[PDB]
Design a protein around this ligand. Structure first.
Ligand SMILES: Nc1nc2ncc(CNCCN3CCC(SC[C@H]4O[C@@H](n5cnc6c(N)ncnc65)[C@H](O)[C@@H]4O)CC3)nc2c(=O)[nH]1
Length: 158
């Protein structure tokens, strides 16, 4: 099954956090990374005094069930998501979202797939379009069409 995963980090210098999360993703059992989008720098949703986000998409081949993949992504956020802030551990700055899991539709307490808000987020849709331009959602909407219809601005690379 091909799962598409969104990575975001809003650390001032997020490259090494993002690199560590990609390494950890590739170490998930019965799984392996097929492709990684470029890294994009996007303004934060809301207050603009806040730090920019680094966003990327990852294609991961996996034979895990969806909630097992989620357990791994949540473990990775716990282990890698916090950077040492001199005298103490900083806030969580890394997000890992499951955007798609094969052609599955999932609505449980833990998991909504396709991701509940990705259709509104250029910073999710554009990196996904880089690695999967012909992508079709389970309901038959085409990724290309959603971008064409909403005309989100293209993103700057980090
Ligand atoms: N420029 C830019 N601005 C941004 N502004 C705001 C944000 C906000 N963080 C996105 C991650 N936010 C918040 C934390 C919750 S975390 C709660 C819960 O979400 C549940 N969940 C349900 N479906 C899920 C799924 N498909 N993938 C993963 N978790 C799933 C899960 O059980 C968890 O307990 C997951 C969704 N990001 C960006 C960004 O990047 N870029």
């Amino acid at each position: 099954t091909v799962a598409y995963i969104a990575i975001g980090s809003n650390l001032a210098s997020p490259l090494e956090q993002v690199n560590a999360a990609l390494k950890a993703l590739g170490d998930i059992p019965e799984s392996h990374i097929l492709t990684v989008s470029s890294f994009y720098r996007t303004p934060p949703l809301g207050p603009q005094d806040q730090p920019d986000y680094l966003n990327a998409a990852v294609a991961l081949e996996t034979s895990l069930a969806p909630e097992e993949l989620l357990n791994h992504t949540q473990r990775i956020e716990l282990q890698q998501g916090r950077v040492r802030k001199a005298e103490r551990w900083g806030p969580r700055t890394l997000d890992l979202d499951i955007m798609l899991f094969g052609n599955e539709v999932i609505n449980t307490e833990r998991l909504t797939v396709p991701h509940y808000d990705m259709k509104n987020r250029g910073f999710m849709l554009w990196p996904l379009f880089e690695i999967a331009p012909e992508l079709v959602f389970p309901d038959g909407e085409m990724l290309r069409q959603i971008l064409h219809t909403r005309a989100f601005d293209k993103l700057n690379k980090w």
